[PDB]
């Protein structure tokens, strides 16, 4: 009876895989980036990457390889998920719409199977006869690639060697032949087998088994010209073949493990080698000509090329360009040069891609004082480590802001034909037109020539020929640049006036009620051309330079008044081409077609708040696609702006937005302002490159933020950040970090680079005297990061071998100071379990960190939370609750000790709490009167916990090492010794992400209950809320209906995706909504929407209300 809802806030940003090839077409070079459940398809260009296609999969991508079966024009995509969904995928373009089709699929998972060490390996043989799969120990699986087999049937072949490190198919081989390093007693080896598929046997390979290095771990199969196998291990690199053997051991590559390779030239002459330190190598195969024999291997060599971000994936592209897929840091695009620069670096960055990395911990703050949540993460590790400040929405920087009421429009206007800066932006008051004589400092109310202070401007653009145009209510007027005198004018033959403007820089292309003219202001006059009349009253107009026009404009957008329609004409012309009935009863308020970068659309804002958008085209003249999306509750007002190279649409309303686009699909992001009525781009004197903003009853000018839905800050650290707390009174963050140092010549330890803890402004060390009785070591610190500048104000170092595990910031009992507190442990590589450790009580009143209280403990203080003005804490399977004397010391209260490793704690504000490792979870209350711990209930499942959260009094949420979520509840029935003692897992759902931290808060605030944010190893941010039974059921319903509707890449079943899955068991998801799924209801076509409303009422327009309302939870 538990009802919950999970949505993604930020997609996974860590890169898990990346392959290069010819998937879009044969003339075409692609790069496929795998994230987790997402697949990214780019085309390699002279500049970098052409985004072409991003989809989602219903599983974690675990193998991703491209191949070419017999007689296929382009490559196919092989993919294998971690739940053992295999499919072959194809790229099909048909239309201007792209589709990723499943050639074949099936689940290749076996009942008999122990998931080996080093996980899943998916290889494909060079002739494309077969795909080799190593899922479990002692078995090799084989999916034959004959044009039948669309279901992907497989056989297994008992593998005598039950501990394989790595495997590849060998090039230049008569039968399919494997090559792999394995471990037994006696060390590590390489062996070869041929694979015969007629036989389903493993036949003797082409060459005798040799021994290789104890740490050999990578097998590269060299292409036909050389055709052997390189073997990468700590310290050693070696080529094997038939009876060839070659072996270099350059002492450079001993410092750090090689973890990833990539082939550079197709013949196998040069490779890339990714190191755990981020160093990039070139492995060079010295090739040597006989005349007749075959081209051979002379020698092996390594060049230290330089430094990338810590590479997990790596792929060479066109012409020196290499993509660097990182999991621990930002992914990048780098250049390889033949000549080094200063410091000997052949490598140069071109582009850097945000990875929110492993998010090891986080918290939510109100940084900018407003009730909007801001999220700050501990991200990355080692040299990639960092903080990331994450903000919802787009921001603007407020300068001088004149409290100027009732304003009605504005345009980019100057007072000269000179400086591209401007001094007066004549707008339009309530029925009126006014003047802002502004030196770019202070404003003035001296009114101007011909711009009568009792009429109104509709358009007012930079019209050449020495004039300051003023298409007014009455009818277009003229005030000269230099002369400033009233030049020429217009007036309606009857007694009538312009009602709707529309122009560029040489036109007056307006409307009088239903009439539509065109009056040219050449060298200071008026010059009419074409004329029609509308069946209805004209509401709005669009025309602007589109194609290769300057003066006279080509096409024509029209929003009419009684039939509620938007139509496509010409202008001149006005002829009918496409009438789109918008339906309902609110008239269009603004109309726009626009240059994105490459592709065109139509957008129309009704006066209710909604907006429609279509598939236009600035050259033919005909509409297509339909979509509806609501913004404001007031009539929305549109405008284009160019900020970088590209052009977006600012939408003005009570909920001001910006219209964007990914590939060329449409995105709608908030702007972080109160309300906005009118707006225009700028470039001024006292306020250069900018945006003018007419609001409720003020005005404003300032610059504008990035683009994305999310804003992301980034404070690099060059060491591993591990925990984080905000202290408001101190107005700073406490952050726990770790840095690596190696063995010194004098046995000491130093450091490979400047870290945040070494470069800290003030510093200090641990003067505790208790624990006193080629080599790597972790030095651990507590950093004091400033709140606004994010500089490292102070760095305290801990004892040698003291790891900092936990961190809190709080008041304790009657003392009115805020201490920060840290819980540590004495780690020696040898010792299996920490025997010692301490809780340390710091004070940062100002300037420095004072040690205020120190308390020895008997194990690793894995975590601690503030209680009720007490200190709750766990110590190596023990949960103590310390009190804080008026004499400044922590004295013990009670301790629970029935648990195996208590890793995680949270507190039901009051007196209840969770905690318990490997077991699963446990509920526990503090009995005030007794001064005691009472174990209330327990969940009895073998969940290896990673995170824990109290949703409420009777709901406990938990994340487990197998990418599952679940919810526990105490039973609501009699016999309070038994049933009230166990707690039922009332919710089950498979996330597909590893969760490190839950914490209550939200990014939205300027249908659902509660807000719990969560961060993941992959840099994915997620959100959990609660639901009523009816919502749950409405939503549950809509999910099955949708599954039927939505085509899935590869054709994997959504129910199978979201199922709970461990080694022990597999269950359908319960009590959980896949908000991502629910949300994707808005992307499907109008036909497909109706398909699932069928059957209080039941309507699609109605459903998109509910989903639009759900989307704004995050």
């Amino acid at each position: 009876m538990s009802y919950n809802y999970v949505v993604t806030a930020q997609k996974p940003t860590a890169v898990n895989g990346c392959v290069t090839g010819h998937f879009t077409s044969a003339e075409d070079l692609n790069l496929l980036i795998a994230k987790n459940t997402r697949l990214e398809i780019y085309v390699v260009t002279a500049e970098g990457l052409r985004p072409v296609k991003e989809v989602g999969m219903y599983g974690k991508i675990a193998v991703m390889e491209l191949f070419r079966p017999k007689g296929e024009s382009k490559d196919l995509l092989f993919i294998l998920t971690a739940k053992y969904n295999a499919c072959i995928l194809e790229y099909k373009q048909s239309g201007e719409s792209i589709d990723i089709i499943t050639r074949a699929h099936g689940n290749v998972q076996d009942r008999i199977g122990r998931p080996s060490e080093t996980g899943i390996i998916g290889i494909i043989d060079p002739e494309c006869r077969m795909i080799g799969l190593r899922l479990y120990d002692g078995l090799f699986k084989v999916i034959p690639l004959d044009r039948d087999n669309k279901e992907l049937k497989a056989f297994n072949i008992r593998l005598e060697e039950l501990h394989v490190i790595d495997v590849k198919f060998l090039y230049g081989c008569q039968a399919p032949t494997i090559c792999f390093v394995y471990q037994d007693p006696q060390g590590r080896h390489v062996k070869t087998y041929e694979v015969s598929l007629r036989e389903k046997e493993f036949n003797k390979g082409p060459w005798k088994q040799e021994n290789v290095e104890a740490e050999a771990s990578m097998v590269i199969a060299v292409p036909e010209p050389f055709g052997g196998a390189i073997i990468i291990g700590q310290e050693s690199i070696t080529y094997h073949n038939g009876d060839k053997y070659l072996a270099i051991a350059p002492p450079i590559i001993k410092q750090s493990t090689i973890v990833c390779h990539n082939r550079v030239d197709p013949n196998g002459s040069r490779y890339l080698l990714g190191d755990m330190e981020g160093r990039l190598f070139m492995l060079l195969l010295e090739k040597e000509e006989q005349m007749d024999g075959t081209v051979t291997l002379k020698d092996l060599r390594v060049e230290l090329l330089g430094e990338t971000s810590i590479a997990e994936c790596l792929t060479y592209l066109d012409n020196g360009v290499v993509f660097v897929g990182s999991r621990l840091g930002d992914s990048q695009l780098v250049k390889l040069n033949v000549d080094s620069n200063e410091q000997g670096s052949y490598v140069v960055a071109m582009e850097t891609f945000t990875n929110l990395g492993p998010i090891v911990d986080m918290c939510v703050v109100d940084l900018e004082r407003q009730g909007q949540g801001q999220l700050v993460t501990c991200s990355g590790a080692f040299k990639e480590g960092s903080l990331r400040i994450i903000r919802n929405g787009i921001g603007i920087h407020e300068h001088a802001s004149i409290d100027l009421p009732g304003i009605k429009g504005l345009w980019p206007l100057r007072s000269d034909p000179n400086r591209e800066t401007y001094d007066t932006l004549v707008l339009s008051f309530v029925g009126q037109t006014r003047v802002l004589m502004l030196n770019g400092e202070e404003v003035e109310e001296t009114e101007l020539m011909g711009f009568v202070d009792d009429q109104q401007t509709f358009f007012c653009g930079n019209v050449a020929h020495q004039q300051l145009i003023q298409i007014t209510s009455a009818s277009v007027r003229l005030v000269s640049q230099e002369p400033k005198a009233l030049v020429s004018e217009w007036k309606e033959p009857q007694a009538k006036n312009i009602s709707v403007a529309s122009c560029n820089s040489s036109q007056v292309v307006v409307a009088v009620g239903r009439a539509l003219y065109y009056l040219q202001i050449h060298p200071q006059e008026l010059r009419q051309i074409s004329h029609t009349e509308m069946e209805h009253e004209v509401a709005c107009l669009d025309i602007t330079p589109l194609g290769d026009s300057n003066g006279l404009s080509p096409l024509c957008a029209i929003g009419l008044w009684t039939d509620i329609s938007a139509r496509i004409l010409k202008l001149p012309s006005f002829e009918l081409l496409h009438k789109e009935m918008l339906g309902g009863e609110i008239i269009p308020r603004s109309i726009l077609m626009t240059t994105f970068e490459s592709s065109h659309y139509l957008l129309c804002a009704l006066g209710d708040g909604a907006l429609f958008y279509f598939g236009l085209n600035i050259e033919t003249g005909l509409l297509s696609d339909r979509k509806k999306v609501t913004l404001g509750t007031q009539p929305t007002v549109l405008r284009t702006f160019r900020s970088l190279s590209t052009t977006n649409v600012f939408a003005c309303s009570d909920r001001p937005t910006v219209i964007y686009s990914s590939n060329h699909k449409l995105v709608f992001s908030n702007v972080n302002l109160k309300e906005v009525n009118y707006m225009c781009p700028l470039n001024s004197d006292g306020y250069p490159d900018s945006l003018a903003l007419a609001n409720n009853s003020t005005l404003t000018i300032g610059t504008i933020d990035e683009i994305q839905k999310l804003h992301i800050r980034t404070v690099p650290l060059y060491e591993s950040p591990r925990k984080i707390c905000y202290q408001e009174v101190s107005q700073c963050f406490g952050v726990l970090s770790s840095r690596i140092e190696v063995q010194d010549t004098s046995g000491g330890t130093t450091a490979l680079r400047p870290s945040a803890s070494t470069q800290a402004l003030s510093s200090s060390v641990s003067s505790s005297k208790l624990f006193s009785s080629g080599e790597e070591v972790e030095v651990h610190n507590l950093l004091i990061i400033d709140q606004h500048t994010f500089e490292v104000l102070h760095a305290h170092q801990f004892l040698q071998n003291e790891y900092a595990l936990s961190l809190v910031s709080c008041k304790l009992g009657k003392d009115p100071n805020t201490y920060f507190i840290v819980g540590t442990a004495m780690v020696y590589p040898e010792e299996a379990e920490p025997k010692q450790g301490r809780i340390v009580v710091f004070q940062y009143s100002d300037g420095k960190l004072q040690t205020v209280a120190e308390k020895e403990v008997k194990g690793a203080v894995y975590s601690m939370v503030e209680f009720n003005g007490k200190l709750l804490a766990s110590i190596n399977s023990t949960v103590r609750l310390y009190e804080w004397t008026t004499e400044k010391d922590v004295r013990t209260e009670c301790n629970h000790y029935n648990n195996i490793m208590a890793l995680y704690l949270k507190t039901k504000g009051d007196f209840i709490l969770v905690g318990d490792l490997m077991r699963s979870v446990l509920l526990l209350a503090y009995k005030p009167m007794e001064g005691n711990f009472e174990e209330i209930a327990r969940d009895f499942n073998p969940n290896w916990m990673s995170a824990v959260e109290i949703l409420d009094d009777d709901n406990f949420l938990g994340a487990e090492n197998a990418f599952n979520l679940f919810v526990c509840q105490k039973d609501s029935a009699a016999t309070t010794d038994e049933e009230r003692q166990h707690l039922q897992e009332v919710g089950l759902f498979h996330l597909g992400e590893f969760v490190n931290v839950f914490c209550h808060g939200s990014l939205v605030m300027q249908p659902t209950q509660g807000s719990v944010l969560f961060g993941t190893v992959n840099g994915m941010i997620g959100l959990v809320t609660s639901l009523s039974e009816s919502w749950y059921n409405l939503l549950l319903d809509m999910q099955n209906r949708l599954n039927k509707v939505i085509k899935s890449v590869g054709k994997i079943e959504h129910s199978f995706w979201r199922s709970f899955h461990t080694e022990r068991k597999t269950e359908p998801a319960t009590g959980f909504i896949d908000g991502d799924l629910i949300e994707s209801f808005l992307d499907i076509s109008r036909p497909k929407m109706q398909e699932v409303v069928a059957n209080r009422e039941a309507t699609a327009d109605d459903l998109i209300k509910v989903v639009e309302e759900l989307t704004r939870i995050h």
């Binding site: 492993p358 590790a381 591990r722 790891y803 442990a825 920490p834």
Partner: peptide, 14 residues
């Protein structure tokens, strides 16, 4: 050192 092995998981490792 379980502490180590432990933290490694947080970084998504063996």
């Amino acid at each position: 050192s379980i502490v180590r092995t432990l933290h490694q998981h947080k970084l998504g490792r063996a």
